[PDB]
Paper text:
To obtain molecular insights into how lipocalins function as allergens, we determined crystal structures of a major dog allergen Can f 1 (C118S, aa 27–171) and its cross-reactive homolog minor cat allergen Fel d 7 (wild-type, aa 27–170) at a resolution of 1.6 Å and 2.2 Å, respectively. Can f 1 and Fel d 7 have a typical lipocalin fold consisting of central eight anti-parallel beta strands, a flanking 310, and an α-helix close to the C-termini. The most disordered regions for both structures are the N- and C-termini. Both Can f 1 and Fel d 7 have an open positively charged calyx at the center of an anti-parallel beta-barrel.
Our Can f 1 (C118S) structure, hereafter Can f 1, has a higher resolution and contains one molecule per asymmetric unit. IgE antibodies to Can f 1 can be found in ∼70% of patients allergic to dog extract. While Can f 1 shows electron densities for most loops flanking beta-strands, some Fel d 7 loop regions are disordered: Arg44-Trp48, Glu122-Gln127, and Asn158-Glu160. While the calyx of Can f 1 is somewhat larger than that of Fel d 7, both have significantly more interior surface area and volume than other dog lipocalins such as Can f 2 (15), Can f 4 (16), and Can f 6 (17). Can f 1 (C118S) and wild type Can f 1 showed similar pattern of the percent fluorescence reduction (data not shown). Subsequent molecular dynamics simulations for 3 microseconds showed that the carboxylate of the ligands samples between the two positively charged residues (R101 and K131 for Can f 1; R102 and K132 for Fel d 7). The negative charge of the acid head group is neutralized by the positively charged environment of the calyx, either by R101/K131 or R102/K132 in Can f 1 or Fel d 7, respectively. Indeed, simulations with 2 oleate molecules confirmed that 2 oleates could remain bound for up to 3 μs to Can f 1, however 2 oleate molecules only stayed briefly bound to Fel d 7. For both Can f 1 and Fel d 7, approximately a 2:1 ratio of oleate to protein was measured. We identified that the Lys131 of Can f 1 (Lys 132 for Fel d 7) in the calyx is the critical residue for ligand binding.
Author numbering: 27 to 171
């Protein structure tokens, strides 16, 4: 499952059960690198407030396909295929910077926007009790490494 989601993605949309102050102006592609040993390394760059912010998150494999842990075990991340092909949905729960926050993210192989994938993501998000507005992200190679 790890190898299946590896490679280049576009982070299309995200939502949470809390405020999430830092809304980036744009993001570079999300790179999911499958590592020897089964873990995933997620890398993305954000343009926020006139500066380039590189983010690296190591996702640790569990016995459940698609289920990973993060941030020294204080966070769980579920990765599963969307009903629309070449899209994936992330859902995470637990601690993040010392607070309990739950998030969902929509990933797409291609930059083209899929209305069906977004609609399914909205439904998924509601079914997880993520009822804030859906935040759709701007794609750009600005700040790319």
């Amino acid at each position: 499952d790890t190898v299946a989601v590896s490679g280049k993605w576009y982070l299309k949309a995200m939502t949470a059960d809390q405020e999430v102050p830092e809304k980036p102006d744009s993001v570079t592609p999300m790179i999911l690198k499958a590592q020897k040993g089964g873990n995933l390394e997620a890398k993305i760059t954000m343009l926020t407030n006139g500066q380039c912010q590189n983010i690296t998150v190591v996702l640790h494999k569990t016995s459940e396909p698609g289920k990973y842990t993060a941030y020294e075990g204080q966070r769980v991340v579920f990765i599963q295929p969307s009903p629309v092909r070449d899209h994936y949905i992330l859902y995470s729960e637990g601690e993040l910077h010392g607070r309990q926050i739950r998030m969902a993210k929509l990933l797409g192989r291609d930059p083209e926007q899929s209305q069906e994938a977004l609609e399914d993501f909205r439904e998924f998000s509601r079914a997880k009790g993520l009822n804030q507005e859906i935040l759709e992200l701007a794609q750009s190679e600005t700040c790319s490494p």
